[model samples]
Target: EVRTIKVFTTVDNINLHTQVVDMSMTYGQQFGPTYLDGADVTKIKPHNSHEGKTFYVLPNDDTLRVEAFEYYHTTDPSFLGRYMSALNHTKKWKYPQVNGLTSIKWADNNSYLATALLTLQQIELKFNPPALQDAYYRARAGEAANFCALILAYCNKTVGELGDVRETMSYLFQHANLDSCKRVLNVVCKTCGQQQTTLKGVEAVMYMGTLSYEQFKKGVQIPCTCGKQATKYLVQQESPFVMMSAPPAQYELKHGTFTCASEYTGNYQCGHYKHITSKETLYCIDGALLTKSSEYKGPITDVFYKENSYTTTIK
Candidate 1:
């Protein structure tokens, strides 16, 4: 059967800006309960806490749907209660998991995050107070995608053959990257200062081309993954892998991993400072950790395959 469809301009941000007012005027014109002979009231709500409220949309096929709710189970509720008072009619039902804030790696998730962090590293070093202020906002309440990108870039883990695609998807489902961001970058607003920067060898130094914090902040301090308060004057020995005045931490140029804390933990920054080790046994796959740095050598960083992350992984 062929049917005619109508298209109209929706008010900009109509869905997000105004729901109660918008629903009162034009809701039924597009979506509504047609099966009911005539109903005065119907309430809309979600199935669970993990799920937010649901707004009725035009069903794909069914123009009419039947629904009601008892004091117990309901798809829709008319009266006030902890449960649905009416059913919204489930012609076809399926459960969907809301992607967590860590759902950064969708597409531009990693690259954007890398950009933000990279910029932040530079800003911190340059001591660009203005940049610092803006970075704090983006770091704390910035869009979820930006955060996702940062995590992917820093952890440098991949579940896909093509870059951090797998890593990005992994972030959406449960939270491998989120765990690391909180656990590693501690990329919160409070940790946004130059006091919490870290470096790596072979991996970041060898591959990521050395970047200067000099332009962003002069007399900047280079920190260790071990979370030491001691300052290191960053000097490139013209080698891709040596950082000057850096800690005594010896590093290797394998598929090594690293971690740093964003906040101060003891004399060291827990989430921003890092530790370099080849010990993969220390990390939990379910948790987040910065694995891409020269400092991360734990198992959690290596457990995820770039292929598995991008190809097999689905949110």
Candidate 2:
């Protein structure tokens, strides 16, 4: 990920005009490289024209460079330490400890000074802060933290691995509040044939007041108004979030199979005997048998038949 930090400094004292210095650090397996504005400054060399000046050079290239200056005064206190402390205060910047803040020291040579500046810039960018103040507030909240942990566990990833802050926050905001945002199932009572269309997962928790995504995915059971326990079902029309596509049409036997033979008495035989049988097949959808012929007419896409069960896809 490319982490960035913008430092603003005053250029004109009269008008208090300021300009932005963009410091960025690209992170890979470990610390990758650092950048000043758009120029890479991972390597430094002595300037050709000036006696004490230094040049920020790119890897394996000496001609292309940016002039360096001693921005920190000789008598100034430890600026890198203060910057590290500020970064540690933010919740989003969790990786890369601040213990290596004093690796580069102050010196008379401009190259050392430039190295120090680059190190400080890299550390500052490493402590990635959120874009909005509300993000900080939400990150610090206990409820939001718990929601984030739940999401991380669901995804089987750590917070650092799930790098997108905006996406995580959006998901947390949408699913954390069970009262506002609800997941429901549509079902029908087996005895009274009454339809219950709105049964939220939060209300179906077993003993506990919370529901997990896995539990919701499997299904839930709730009681009906007819004083009988009904297994609440999920159909694409009502609970689209749980299903990837519409479930296949189901089939069942409405009449038992039988055979008939036409023949005479035992010894008085004669004409050839024939056997025949007939049965009715029933098509069901969402636990309800189809009552009309038109309900079974559609473009068939797929079919599965095994163990006397049938599942057909019809558009």
Candidate 3:
């Protein structure tokens, strides 16, 4: 937790001088005049040094002036660490005046660069490095083409040959919004007894609207590849909604479909209909179950209830 403070001073000829110094030393210790003495004034060289006169390092005031110190703690040991440290430094600082100190105040030096850097840090921390690096190179070319590259990099999208960067950014932002906010569901076809997965939530609501948990519980009607509407679905087992203190509700479907072994006497008398009949079941979020019974009513059909088994567990 090493912290440093910046020292500011005014020289007779130099006008304004500033230097960063370590401030993690012992508390209650006073910084004397020696701390501010002998500042290198030769470093202040102008563009036309040959036409300029020699300058002296005489102190303008007897009192030393020090600006509040900006301190931040970070465990990251790379460039990101330094970037966050510097970003935090520009936003706020600590002053030891007024006996001890006053409330932490925001600095006036906060600029658009700092805000952009903050967004960059946030995206870097959230996403994978390879994608970020890819976006970085793509945005580099866009930046040379006079576009706000950070926004382009964040959305991880490329501009077209004759595309407007602003419009592209807006489109990419909308795409990312849909990409990030969505829930997955394991849908089972009621007609064909087929199971498949689909995305729901914000993916369902493309426009400006909200989808509640209850609405999601009612489930989505995604068409199955088997040419049947998938009316029964369960929320995926894996979700961020589960917590250690209060775990998610778990449900298991022990028996899914029934099979007809022996052929008996039945209605219309179809080959496949006489052989097997499948059951349709819906597993809800609140542990509620809706099962569709078999329509076959034939005694000759061997009723092997436990022959074909299907179980789906969702937590």
Candidate 4:
């Protein structure tokens, strides 16, 4: 159902800004329990109005929505928080002497976060400060997709095989506090970024928090599967496989499968080299190592297929 909200500006005392709110779209996600009343509170899809501009819904289902769309606007909840701080600092306005200065509250957590982000943006824009802006950017980049790619790299032992995880980790490292962000990223990553390792590659990357931090440390060797020769770069290199710096340990001509983080483990099967004395295929599978191998025939029997077999040699 369509609804309207009336808005009045404090500065100019404009007559009335009509805001159309779809209690469904505005309240559907979080405040449903409070406003839904067993109803689906729905989206009143956008349409063109007589004014020839796109109109939509927002606010308390009180006023009408009109375009153009905006982000990081001065009127956003976050901007308000920063505006209040500025007022307090100047002793220009009475802003309730709120504590934590940064922990301002409002209708909901979304608004609070919006306020935080806005505050960051405003501070960055006005003062051009490095710390605040960097914090804002770092937090914003922590998408579940980025988080999941990280684990897929580990489980499949492709953890640092590419630059994706390195970039994510760098952004994560910028965070002043890591635990809360890590917790949220991991929780969200389960849904958004799970890597699609083929049926045979379904695997686990355990104790991720412990492992994540360990690999970020300087000098730690994040291996690729060369039982699988996984190549990764410490710096942002020109090629995905090139390394900016040399690793602490070097791979032997016949090395075991390289893995990320000691505590983490997975079960990708290794196919032996075709040579007569192909030394134990070094404890790694081709999928994890990024190694090249001759093709294998499959399904001699269901049991035979499951046990081991990249390239069938003999019985």
**Clash count list over all predictions:** 43, 0, 4, 23
Tens digit of per-residue lDDT, candidate 3, span 52-101: 23222223233311110101111122322222223233223322111111
Candidate 2 residue-wise lDDT, 234-293, digit = tens: 322221121111112222211222111011112222211111111143222210111222
Task: Give stretches of model 1 more than 4 Å off.
Answer: 1-136, 146-161, 164-315
For model 3, the run of ten residues with the poorest summed lDDT: 64-73
The 10-residue segment with the lowest total lDDT in model 1: 305-314
CA lDDT scores, all candidates in order: 0.24, 0.24, 0.28, 0.22
TM-score top scorer = 3
lDDT of 1 by residue, 1-315 (tens): 122222221111023111222332333543442111112122422112212223433222322112111111213222111111111211111111111112122221123232223222221122112212332345444333223322332334331213322233232222111211110011112233333333322221211111222211122333445564433333222221111122222223233322211111122221112222223332211112333332322211111111101111111
Candidate 4, 259-278: lDDT as tens digits: 11111012223111111011
Model 3: how far is 264 from its true place, Å?
60
Model 3 C-alpha lDDT versus the unseen true structure = 0.28
Native-referenced Cα lDDT, model 4? 0.22
TM-score of each: 0.19, 0.21, 0.23, 0.20
Worst 10 residues of 2 by lDDT: 257-266
Deviation (Å) of 278 in candidate 2: 48
Superior candidate under TM-score, 2 versus 3: 3
